[PDB]
């Protein structure tokens, strides 16, 4: 002991060299200093009272971190004050725990004792057991016995046999539970606890850790609920794996399922941009790569693989794992071994077999602050999922440009409903109108019904990644009765332009005349519009009555027609121009500029603007657009250039269900995008685009003339 | 040569050691790389066509930087291609310039030729003449005469004798003009041009540089228009001074007016927080200490003084002056000589004599991310001034907390009205309602009349800075007919609390019963309010008809009364709680939550929220409040602590014009603030609060009672 997340040899290596690595030493010293301050407050173990974000909740969180850090610092420095503090905390817990019933403000579905919900109880155990592992050296037999019978065994029992619906769950809450109990199993030398964690309560392998490894990741290491859920699941997966590896290496856990755990870690990184995870489905916008689950996971994977490109990400994290694996990262960074991360455009198939729709991630450009397009053509993702089939996000210049709201929630802020999902999470954040995808008749996809949405996934039609252009194309046939829509999204490299451009083609057919809405949630300040806004007459009225529309104010409506229109905005030092045209038999076309905040008496919603393209009384529409990063603005040096869009216009023609988009540029050149929706790469196609005839092979073609 | 902003000795020093200093070398190499790329485009000198932010405007800007940079790099590297490019640009300018009339899209008030306004023309000359100075010794006599007779002399003549209304102006546009002409005079060895720059066109000293030094700064080096104008004026002041020093050291320009230029540089720094200038009056929110004027000025002042605390600020700038003076900064930093900047609480008297009201800057805490309260008790500042007497700003934790909008303008963005002031600059940004100060009957101070406002300044009643607390108190008796108001703002050190708290007391008396509004423009996301908002019925109406009110949407109203109320919000990793109570005979009082964006069809205005305290109908009110930073939110590590306010309530009592504020804390302790408005430090005062009697001496007292 220790022999779990750190080994005795790890401790010896850390003791020998931690002061030699500047960032590791700064990290370790910060922790030491902070713990010293916490210790001066004494041993403070309150009776459970408060739910999420409340005092007792955050106090017991502070204690599990203290137990773990104290144990580590005892091993590394030899200072008995850290042993004594960790010991005294655990003895206080051992005295208190046996008397605890259900938390007084418990969560209905999975209650805890120490905590309002059993989830945090599992986290407590994961951390606290490591601290215990690290202090066993300095404890008397009777102290071990008291702590083990007082808190560890009763808590392990609670989280396992007394909570079968969580422990046998094939879900990240199950992952946390089996990691907590299994790690306890390894530290305490309790084979039963280890076995039930690996193979479920009945030990058959129908549930448990091995089943979770098979079910909770696609073969490429993608977690269906999204990056936010993925990074959270990554800790109990990678820490229980680390524990299995240090105790039972013969199980070859890091080889399991074609190295699924390694793949899960790389995929977590590939679900981020400029340090932040793509905020799709339930997600908080401030969650990024310095989150501790990925800090630890990266160190573990670096230790296994020696992949020096991981060191690039490590530097971007600005936080290092205080472990033996972290020491290896610090050493390699200090030796100048860092290589750049190889960002790839990837198609991540959804579900355990990677066959339930997919998340497309298209990247173009050098370094971390490149251009990234995300096409969300994924399955539902259960109750965590948003009603946003074929949604998209755009990143550029280190910023989110075309955005996803994430969840309506304030993490661990008790005054915001105990840090839990707010009423507006369902009524705003999940709804289709809140996203950059098609809304029909002011109703959400699947009519906002999770049960229906869970039965369906989008059909991916094409994925292409080349030096000329990038493409994803997908079909949604099940979101509404008598409606089908297809969306193709492209990143096009135009040599004459500073930055790649997005081309978007969203086609819709409906049995009955409908309203079609396509929002664009943008980040930045409007410079100008090509269209004329109607006077709002000094009032903003709620946009609509239901399904998220009741949360939007209408700031202006602007009538539009056959010709393409433009909106240009600034964000930091770059301009963005959205050129858009909609082909439809209907003449009832209008642009709505809306702002978030109606039906929000509790001020839970952020300020946010949106450009909504609306067609009314239509059975068919082709929403076409271009998104163009351009120019420079430097407020510091007081300069600018290329502030005007280089797109003169956008035109669209559809013939025999095949699409042609012509982007006319200001220098007299043009870009032609052609879509056949036919996978046969050798099949020739022909479309009459007004004057000229367009001829191409394959699913798609892009030509710059 | 060179002998202006850099000297021959400077070049020697740089040549001997520039690659020894990492940051200096990195920036020099960056400039070199950028210039090489620019040079690959060839010599591109378009005929003048576009105004602010337009192509020709920004191209000629790129060119003046290129000429200066090329000159410098020629001197440092000895590479002739840099000489050749600087020469070729200037010869192209020499060919074009004599043919130029007024710019085709010229500014009415002060037209340029190369640029739409003469201001940018002066900047061009200031930069380009340094480039010329650096290459002149490598040019043939005929090339020198072509450049001098073709561009520099006619431009100097244009900016001076042909523009007497600008050249003789006691204003920073006059400073830019005299710097441009005077620097030209030194480089060309033309005594006439130097003399008229120093002493005005008629050489009497009624106008010119020396007069500007006397009139444009207070004795403490404060520029009346505000930090945004100060930093801009700082370049021609400090660079012309530098040129004067390298050519005529006997003038002792850096000693003039008790070291006014040195004080002006320090004051510029003292007008910043966490790298950004206080956005008072006409200001753009992205203007900060890395602005080149302060970069060069700081290096110059460091070279003169050897003040190692300036090195702390230089590091925060993240940009170094590529000069000999900048080399000394880089050297001193590399030698580990940096000391922390000594931030001071200061009273900056306004006007040339520092006697027209004042800008109070109160600072508390260590490092750069401390707490800073700004009390704007200043004169109008003429056309650039806002109608916001007794306005305040609060900074904390590296952020602006209680805010000032600045100007409605997008710098060099041609599509936003040629980068000029937008319609909403006058109708929104200048108006009193857009600020954190008293608004009477929905009209701005001085009824929004700049002529009236220019005649008056607030009366500073008290300024105190101690370990226990900080205070500014000021009176405004002229903003409205038959209205007088007094505001006292405090920063209070409460040992039991994590951060200092603001205490605010704003008293108003009016001859006629009036509506009183006190806005608070805050930065961050609302957590909760103690009050109960009325249902807005799914509509936001424009808040009022005139004077800035026409740009706000009413989101919610909520009734308030005798008991104090609270708003708590979050910004990054900290919470802020505003506890507030208003003493008044008024039957009704309301809190209005409003949002910016009404009457903004062109989307010129930013998203912004505001909490407005309204007294419906009264002759008197005392607006009392506490602003409290507290707690921690960490979204990365997923923890919180101290997220609830520690202020239980705030209570106010007035007796015989003397104020007592009691702040009750959740741990059962309290803070008592007493204000007598009597400057006699020995005078005893008594006010009956609850049943307790509050007794103290002096203008103010603050006691923390455990
Ligand atoms: Zn979403
Ligand atoms: Zn202002």
PDB file of C-alpha atoms in Angstrom, chain A residues 208-439:
ATOM      1  CA  UNK A 208     -21.102  -4.856 -14.203  1.00  0.00           C
ATOM      2  CA  UNK A 209     -17.921  -3.160 -15.470  1.00  0.00           C
ATOM      3  CA  UNK A 210     -17.135  -5.539 -18.345  1.00  0.00           C
ATOM      4  CA  UNK A 211     -20.690  -5.181 -19.715  1.00  0.00           C
ATOM      5  CA  UNK A 212     -20.428  -1.374 -19.425  1.00  0.00           C
ATOM      6  CA  UNK A 213     -17.190  -1.416 -21.465  1.00  0.00           C
ATOM      7  CA  UNK A 214     -19.060  -3.303 -24.218  1.00  0.00           C
ATOM      8  CA  UNK A 215     -22.259  -1.233 -24.161  1.00  0.00           C
ATOM      9  CA  UNK A 216     -21.398   2.338 -23.203  1.00  0.00           C
ATOM     10  CA  UNK A 217     -18.946   3.064 -26.027  1.00  0.00           C
ATOM     11  CA  UNK A 218     -19.156   2.709 -29.789  1.00  0.00           C
ATOM     12  CA  UNK A 219     -16.213   0.670 -31.158  1.00  0.00           C
ATOM     13  CA  UNK A 220     -14.399   4.003 -31.705  1.00  0.00           C
ATOM     14  CA  UNK A 221     -14.859   5.045 -28.059  1.00  0.00           C
ATOM     15  CA  UNK A 222     -17.840   7.381 -28.482  1.00  0.00           C
ATOM     16  CA  UNK A 223     -20.362   7.780 -25.632  1.00  0.00           C
ATOM     17  CA  UNK A 224     -23.931   8.280 -26.956  1.00  0.00           C
ATOM     18  CA  UNK A 225     -25.078  10.937 -24.466  1.00  0.00           C
ATOM     19  CA  UNK A 226     -22.291  13.262 -25.712  1.00  0.00           C
ATOM     20  CA  UNK A 227     -18.902  14.779 -24.671  1.00  0.00           C
ATOM     21  CA  UNK A 228     -20.262  16.122 -21.358  1.00  0.00           C
ATOM     22  CA  UNK A 229     -21.404  12.661 -20.267  1.00  0.00           C
ATOM     23  CA  UNK A 230     -18.330  11.051 -21.854  1.00  0.00           C
ATOM     24  CA  UNK A 231     -15.727  12.999 -19.860  1.00  0.00           C
ATOM     25  CA  UNK A 232     -17.643  12.295 -16.633  1.00  0.00           C
ATOM     26  CA  UNK A 233     -17.792   8.558 -17.379  1.00  0.00           C
ATOM     27  CA  UNK A 234     -14.086   8.634 -18.241  1.00  0.00           C
ATOM     28  CA  UNK A 235     -12.953   8.889 -14.584  1.00  0.00           C
ATOM     29  CA  UNK A 236     -14.574   5.779 -13.128  1.00  0.00           C
ATOM     30  CA  UNK A 237     -13.756   3.842 -16.351  1.00  0.00           C
ATOM     31  CA  UNK A 238     -10.080   4.870 -16.350  1.00  0.00           C
ATOM     32  CA  UNK A 239      -9.555   4.761 -12.577  1.00  0.00           C
ATOM     33  CA  UNK A 240     -11.197   1.359 -12.066  1.00  0.00           C
ATOM     34  CA  UNK A 241      -9.142   0.183 -15.075  1.00  0.00           C
ATOM     35  CA  UNK A 242      -5.959   1.601 -13.488  1.00  0.00           C
ATOM     36  CA  UNK A 243      -6.835  -0.237 -10.242  1.00  0.00           C
ATOM     37  CA  UNK A 244      -7.454  -3.485 -12.174  1.00  0.00           C
ATOM     38  CA  UNK A 245      -4.122  -3.039 -14.009  1.00  0.00           C
ATOM     39  CA  UNK A 246      -2.068  -2.395 -10.839  1.00  0.00           C
ATOM     40  CA  UNK A 247      -3.628  -5.334  -8.958  1.00  0.00           C
ATOM     41  CA  UNK A 248      -4.554  -7.896 -11.639  1.00  0.00           C
ATOM     42  CA  UNK A 249      -2.426  -7.075 -14.742  1.00  0.00           C
ATOM     43  CA  UNK A 250      -3.246 -10.522 -16.186  1.00  0.00           C
ATOM     44  CA  UNK A 251      -6.794  -9.266 -16.916  1.00  0.00           C
ATOM     45  CA  UNK A 252      -5.222  -7.015 -19.602  1.00  0.00           C
ATOM     46  CA  UNK A 253      -7.910  -4.347 -19.037  1.00  0.00           C
ATOM     47  CA  UNK A 254      -6.236  -1.777 -21.320  1.00  0.00           C
ATOM     48  CA  UNK A 255      -6.285  -4.274 -24.196  1.00  0.00           C
ATOM     49  CA  UNK A 256      -9.981  -5.134 -23.728  1.00  0.00           C
ATOM     50  CA  UNK A 257     -12.318  -4.677 -26.721  1.00  0.00           C
ATOM     51  CA  UNK A 258      -9.576  -3.566 -29.147  1.00  0.00           C
ATOM     52  CA  UNK A 259      -8.206  -1.036 -26.628  1.00  0.00           C
ATOM     53  CA  UNK A 260     -11.603   0.580 -25.987  1.00  0.00           C
ATOM     54  CA  UNK A 261     -10.373   2.620 -22.989  1.00  0.00           C
ATOM     55  CA  UNK A 262      -7.493   4.102 -24.978  1.00  0.00           C
ATOM     56  CA  UNK A 263      -9.922   4.926 -27.815  1.00  0.00           C
ATOM     57  CA  UNK A 264     -12.362   6.535 -25.330  1.00  0.00           C
ATOM     58  CA  UNK A 265      -9.646   8.947 -24.168  1.00  0.00           C
ATOM     59  CA  UNK A 266      -8.521  10.034 -27.654  1.00  0.00           C
ATOM     60  CA  UNK A 267     -12.182  10.420 -28.649  1.00  0.00           C
ATOM     61  CA  UNK A 268     -12.800  12.652 -25.585  1.00  0.00           C
ATOM     62  CA  UNK A 269     -10.036  14.950 -26.870  1.00  0.00           C
ATOM     63  CA  UNK A 270     -11.495  14.752 -30.422  1.00  0.00           C
ATOM     64  CA  UNK A 271     -14.803  15.996 -28.954  1.00  0.00           C
ATOM     65  CA  UNK A 272     -13.220  19.326 -27.965  1.00  0.00           C
ATOM     66  CA  UNK A 273     -12.126  22.576 -29.572  1.00  0.00           C
ATOM     67  CA  UNK A 274      -9.790  25.243 -28.140  1.00  0.00           C
ATOM     68  CA  UNK A 275     -10.088  23.550 -24.745  1.00  0.00           C
ATOM     69  CA  UNK A 276     -13.877  23.070 -24.529  1.00  0.00           C
ATOM     70  CA  UNK A 277     -16.189  20.130 -25.224  1.00  0.00           C
ATOM     71  CA  UNK A 278     -18.891  20.443 -27.877  1.00  0.00           C
ATOM     72  CA  UNK A 279     -21.944  21.466 -25.860  1.00  0.00           C
ATOM     73  CA  UNK A 280     -24.400  19.046 -27.507  1.00  0.00           C
ATOM     74  CA  UNK A 281     -27.270  17.499 -25.498  1.00  0.00           C
ATOM     75  CA  UNK A 282     -27.124  18.086 -21.732  1.00  0.00           C
ATOM     76  CA  UNK A 283     -23.850  20.001 -21.320  1.00  0.00           C
ATOM     77  CA  UNK A 284     -22.435  23.021 -19.533  1.00  0.00           C
ATOM     78  CA  UNK A 285     -20.508  25.505 -21.643  1.00  0.00           C
ATOM     79  CA  UNK A 286     -17.665  25.982 -19.149  1.00  0.00           C
ATOM     80  CA  UNK A 287     -16.636  22.301 -19.209  1.00  0.00           C
ATOM     81  CA  UNK A 288     -13.304  21.721 -20.922  1.00  0.00           C
ATOM     82  CA  UNK A 289     -10.168  19.606 -21.162  1.00  0.00           C
ATOM     83  CA  UNK A 290      -8.715  20.643 -17.793  1.00  0.00           C
ATOM     84  CA  UNK A 291     -11.569  18.685 -16.165  1.00  0.00           C
ATOM     85  CA  UNK A 292      -9.835  16.201 -13.839  1.00  0.00           C
ATOM     86  CA  UNK A 293     -11.197  13.063 -15.550  1.00  0.00           C
ATOM     87  CA  UNK A 294      -9.322  13.933 -18.753  1.00  0.00           C
ATOM     88  CA  UNK A 295      -6.208  15.186 -16.937  1.00  0.00           C
ATOM     89  CA  UNK A 296      -5.861  11.772 -15.231  1.00  0.00           C
ATOM     90  CA  UNK A 297      -6.959   9.798 -18.318  1.00  0.00           C
ATOM     91  CA  UNK A 298      -4.416  11.553 -20.558  1.00  0.00           C
ATOM     92  CA  UNK A 299      -1.584  10.785 -18.123  1.00  0.00           C
ATOM     93  CA  UNK A 300      -2.605   7.111 -17.950  1.00  0.00           C
ATOM     94  CA  UNK A 301      -2.795   6.847 -21.765  1.00  0.00           C
ATOM     95  CA  UNK A 302       0.536   8.670 -22.191  1.00  0.00           C
ATOM     96  CA  UNK A 303       2.128   6.231 -19.719  1.00  0.00           C
ATOM     97  CA  UNK A 304       0.779   3.288 -21.769  1.00  0.00           C
ATOM     98  CA  UNK A 305       1.404   4.560 -25.317  1.00  0.00           C
ATOM     99  CA  UNK A 306       4.244   7.105 -25.153  1.00  0.00           C
ATOM    100  CA  UNK A 307       2.255   9.146 -27.691  1.00  0.00           C
ATOM    101  CA  UNK A 308       4.140  12.469 -27.617  1.00  0.00           C
ATOM    102  CA  UNK A 309       1.277  14.296 -29.380  1.00  0.00           C
ATOM    103  CA  UNK A 310      -0.678  13.857 -26.115  1.00  0.00           C
ATOM    104  CA  UNK A 311       1.829  16.243 -24.512  1.00  0.00           C
ATOM    105  CA  UNK A 312       0.470  19.052 -26.710  1.00  0.00           C
ATOM    106  CA  UNK A 313      -2.988  18.536 -25.149  1.00  0.00           C
ATOM    107  CA  UNK A 314      -1.335  18.248 -21.700  1.00  0.00           C
ATOM    108  CA  UNK A 315       0.123  21.757 -22.101  1.00  0.00           C
ATOM    109  CA  UNK A 316      -3.280  23.064 -23.247  1.00  0.00           C
ATOM    110  CA  UNK A 317      -4.830  21.532 -20.114  1.00  0.00           C
ATOM    111  CA  UNK A 318      -2.506  23.586 -17.866  1.00  0.00           C
ATOM    112  CA  UNK A 319      -3.116  20.973 -15.173  1.00  0.00           C
ATOM    113  CA  UNK A 320      -1.271  17.722 -14.518  1.00  0.00           C
ATOM    114  CA  UNK A 321      -2.248  14.431 -12.837  1.00  0.00           C
ATOM    115  CA  UNK A 322      -0.495  14.206  -9.444  1.00  0.00           C
ATOM    116  CA  UNK A 323       0.229  10.513  -9.924  1.00  0.00           C
ATOM    117  CA  UNK A 324       3.071   8.323 -11.217  1.00  0.00           C
ATOM    118  CA  UNK A 325       1.501   8.594 -14.675  1.00  0.00           C
ATOM    119  CA  UNK A 326       1.412  12.395 -14.378  1.00  0.00           C
ATOM    120  CA  UNK A 327       5.090  12.394 -13.376  1.00  0.00           C
ATOM    121  CA  UNK A 328       5.878  10.695 -16.716  1.00  0.00           C
ATOM    122  CA  UNK A 329       3.993  13.461 -18.567  1.00  0.00           C
ATOM    123  CA  UNK A 330       5.887  16.176 -16.648  1.00  0.00           C
ATOM    124  CA  UNK A 331       9.225  14.499 -17.374  1.00  0.00           C
ATOM    125  CA  UNK A 332       8.512  14.127 -21.114  1.00  0.00           C
ATOM    126  CA  UNK A 333       7.333  17.763 -21.398  1.00  0.00           C
ATOM    127  CA  UNK A 334      10.500  18.855 -19.560  1.00  0.00           C
ATOM    128  CA  UNK A 335      12.625  16.848 -22.013  1.00  0.00           C
ATOM    129  CA  UNK A 336      11.048  18.755 -24.917  1.00  0.00           C
ATOM    130  CA  UNK A 337       9.333  15.684 -26.391  1.00  0.00           C
ATOM    131  CA  UNK A 338       6.062  17.520 -27.198  1.00  0.00           C
ATOM    132  CA  UNK A 339       4.670  16.976 -30.690  1.00  0.00           C
ATOM    133  CA  UNK A 340       1.539  18.658 -32.160  1.00  0.00           C
ATOM    134  CA  UNK A 341      -1.818  16.885 -31.768  1.00  0.00           C
ATOM    135  CA  UNK A 342      -2.998  15.436 -35.076  1.00  0.00           C
ATOM    136  CA  UNK A 343      -6.564  16.673 -35.393  1.00  0.00           C
ATOM    137  CA  UNK A 344      -8.577  14.540 -37.835  1.00  0.00           C
ATOM    138  CA  UNK A 345     -11.973  14.905 -39.472  1.00  0.00           C
ATOM    139  CA  UNK A 346     -13.917  11.922 -38.114  1.00  0.00           C
ATOM    140  CA  UNK A 347     -17.240  10.119 -38.420  1.00  0.00           C
ATOM    141  CA  UNK A 348     -18.290   8.782 -35.024  1.00  0.00           C
ATOM    142  CA  UNK A 349     -21.002   6.148 -35.418  1.00  0.00           C
ATOM    143  CA  UNK A 350     -23.475   6.242 -32.530  1.00  0.00           C
ATOM    144  CA  UNK A 351     -24.493   3.341 -30.244  1.00  0.00           C
ATOM    145  CA  UNK A 352     -22.597   0.255 -29.002  1.00  0.00           C
ATOM    146  CA  UNK A 353     -22.115  -0.997 -32.582  1.00  0.00           C
ATOM    147  CA  UNK A 354     -21.501   2.496 -34.012  1.00  0.00           C
ATOM    148  CA  UNK A 355     -24.459   2.123 -36.375  1.00  0.00           C
ATOM    149  CA  UNK A 356     -27.176   4.485 -35.056  1.00  0.00           C
ATOM    150  CA  UNK A 357     -26.452   7.698 -36.931  1.00  0.00           C
ATOM    151  CA  UNK A 358     -23.188   9.537 -36.314  1.00  0.00           C
ATOM    152  CA  UNK A 359     -21.476  12.675 -35.053  1.00  0.00           C
ATOM    153  CA  UNK A 360     -19.448  14.267 -37.852  1.00  0.00           C
ATOM    154  CA  UNK A 361     -16.469  16.380 -36.827  1.00  0.00           C
ATOM    155  CA  UNK A 362     -14.861  18.287 -39.700  1.00  0.00           C
ATOM    156  CA  UNK A 363     -11.588  20.079 -39.028  1.00  0.00           C
ATOM    157  CA  UNK A 364      -9.582  22.295 -41.369  1.00  0.00           C
ATOM    158  CA  UNK A 365      -6.515  24.442 -40.584  1.00  0.00           C
ATOM    159  CA  UNK A 366      -3.335  24.319 -38.468  1.00  0.00           C
ATOM    160  CA  UNK A 367      -2.905  24.434 -34.682  1.00  0.00           C
ATOM    161  CA  UNK A 368      -5.604  24.406 -32.007  1.00  0.00           C
ATOM    162  CA  UNK A 369      -7.541  27.437 -33.236  1.00  0.00           C
ATOM    163  CA  UNK A 370      -8.594  25.940 -36.583  1.00  0.00           C
ATOM    164  CA  UNK A 371     -12.046  25.713 -38.191  1.00  0.00           C
ATOM    165  CA  UNK A 372     -14.328  22.953 -36.896  1.00  0.00           C
ATOM    166  CA  UNK A 373     -17.785  21.949 -38.112  1.00  0.00           C
ATOM    167  CA  UNK A 374     -19.833  19.512 -36.052  1.00  0.00           C
ATOM    168  CA  UNK A 375     -22.845  17.805 -37.645  1.00  0.00           C
ATOM    169  CA  UNK A 376     -25.116  16.200 -35.053  1.00  0.00           C
ATOM    170  CA  UNK A 377     -26.744  13.355 -37.012  1.00  0.00           C
ATOM    171  CA  UNK A 378     -26.925  11.192 -33.883  1.00  0.00           C
ATOM    172  CA  UNK A 379     -29.440   8.993 -32.039  1.00  0.00           C
ATOM    173  CA  UNK A 380     -31.392  10.452 -29.090  1.00  0.00           C
ATOM    174  CA  UNK A 381     -29.150   9.724 -26.093  1.00  0.00           C
ATOM    175  CA  UNK A 382     -32.056   9.030 -23.703  1.00  0.00           C
ATOM    176  CA  UNK A 383     -33.332  11.692 -21.270  1.00  0.00           C
ATOM    177  CA  UNK A 384     -30.072  13.637 -21.608  1.00  0.00           C
ATOM    178  CA  UNK A 385     -30.659  14.121 -25.350  1.00  0.00           C
ATOM    179  CA  UNK A 386     -31.881  17.195 -27.205  1.00  0.00           C
ATOM    180  CA  UNK A 387     -34.561  17.277 -29.904  1.00  0.00           C
ATOM    181  CA  UNK A 388     -32.149  18.543 -32.515  1.00  0.00           C
ATOM    182  CA  UNK A 389     -31.697  16.026 -35.350  1.00  0.00           C
ATOM    183  CA  UNK A 390     -29.246  17.329 -37.988  1.00  0.00           C
ATOM    184  CA  UNK A 391     -28.173  20.263 -35.769  1.00  0.00           C
ATOM    185  CA  UNK A 392     -24.753  21.801 -36.399  1.00  0.00           C
ATOM    186  CA  UNK A 393     -22.098  23.828 -34.599  1.00  0.00           C
ATOM    187  CA  UNK A 394     -19.269  25.932 -36.011  1.00  0.00           C
ATOM    188  CA  UNK A 395     -15.960  26.783 -34.374  1.00  0.00           C
ATOM    189  CA  UNK A 396     -13.352  29.184 -35.718  1.00  0.00           C
ATOM    190  CA  UNK A 397     -10.492  31.367 -34.474  1.00  0.00           C
ATOM    191  CA  UNK A 398     -10.633  29.757 -30.997  1.00  0.00           C
ATOM    192  CA  UNK A 399     -14.314  30.676 -30.623  1.00  0.00           C
ATOM    193  CA  UNK A 400     -17.739  29.095 -30.921  1.00  0.00           C
ATOM    194  CA  UNK A 401     -19.437  30.881 -33.852  1.00  0.00           C
ATOM    195  CA  UNK A 402     -22.652  28.938 -34.468  1.00  0.00           C
ATOM    196  CA  UNK A 403     -23.600  27.608 -31.092  1.00  0.00           C
ATOM    197  CA  UNK A 404     -25.474  25.019 -29.012  1.00  0.00           C
ATOM    198  CA  UNK A 405     -27.080  26.251 -25.775  1.00  0.00           C
ATOM    199  CA  UNK A 406     -26.326  23.183 -23.635  1.00  0.00           C
ATOM    200  CA  UNK A 407     -28.428  22.642 -20.501  1.00  0.00           C
ATOM    201  CA  UNK A 408     -30.345  25.166 -18.365  1.00  0.00           C
ATOM    202  CA  UNK A 409     -28.511  24.492 -15.098  1.00  0.00           C
ATOM    203  CA  UNK A 410     -26.075  26.180 -12.709  1.00  0.00           C
ATOM    204  CA  UNK A 411     -23.673  23.537 -11.419  1.00  0.00           C
ATOM    205  CA  UNK A 412     -23.613  23.300  -7.621  1.00  0.00           C
ATOM    206  CA  UNK A 413     -25.406  26.643  -7.169  1.00  0.00           C
ATOM    207  CA  UNK A 414     -27.975  25.815  -4.475  1.00  0.00           C
ATOM    208  CA  UNK A 415     -29.962  29.024  -5.103  1.00  0.00           C
ATOM    209  CA  UNK A 416     -30.515  27.706  -8.645  1.00  0.00           C
ATOM    210  CA  UNK A 417     -32.712  24.718  -7.708  1.00  0.00           C
ATOM    211  CA  UNK A 418     -29.967  22.775  -5.871  1.00  0.00           C
ATOM    212  CA  UNK A 419     -27.711  22.909  -8.930  1.00  0.00           C
ATOM    213  CA  UNK A 420     -30.138  20.599 -10.756  1.00  0.00           C
ATOM    214  CA  UNK A 421     -31.808  20.969 -14.180  1.00  0.00           C
ATOM    215  CA  UNK A 422     -34.076  24.001 -14.115  1.00  0.00           C
ATOM    216  CA  UNK A 423     -37.658  24.115 -15.429  1.00  0.00           C
ATOM    217  CA  UNK A 424     -36.301  25.781 -18.582  1.00  0.00           C
ATOM    218  CA  UNK A 425     -34.007  22.811 -19.313  1.00  0.00           C
ATOM    219  CA  UNK A 426     -37.065  20.970 -20.633  1.00  0.00           C
ATOM    220  CA  UNK A 427     -39.050  23.989 -21.874  1.00  0.00           C
ATOM    221  CA  UNK A 428     -36.140  25.744 -23.613  1.00  0.00           C
ATOM    222  CA  UNK A 429     -32.785  23.984 -23.796  1.00  0.00           C
ATOM    223  CA  UNK A 430     -34.009  20.616 -25.141  1.00  0.00           C
ATOM    224  CA  UNK A 431     -36.420  22.044 -27.713  1.00  0.00           C
ATOM    225  CA  UNK A 432     -35.747  22.141 -31.461  1.00  0.00           C
ATOM    226  CA  UNK A 433     -36.309  25.917 -31.782  1.00  0.00           C
ATOM    227  CA  UNK A 434     -33.310  26.348 -29.440  1.00  0.00           C
ATOM    228  CA  UNK A 435     -31.053  24.693 -32.049  1.00  0.00           C
ATOM    229  CA  UNK A 436     -29.676  25.287 -35.575  1.00  0.00           C
ATOM    230  CA  UNK A 437     -31.997  22.800 -37.326  1.00  0.00           C
ATOM    231  CA  UNK A 438     -35.444  22.579 -38.936  1.00  0.00           C
ATOM    232  CA  UNK A 439     -38.589  23.242 -36.894  1.00  0.00           C
TER     233      UNK A 439
END
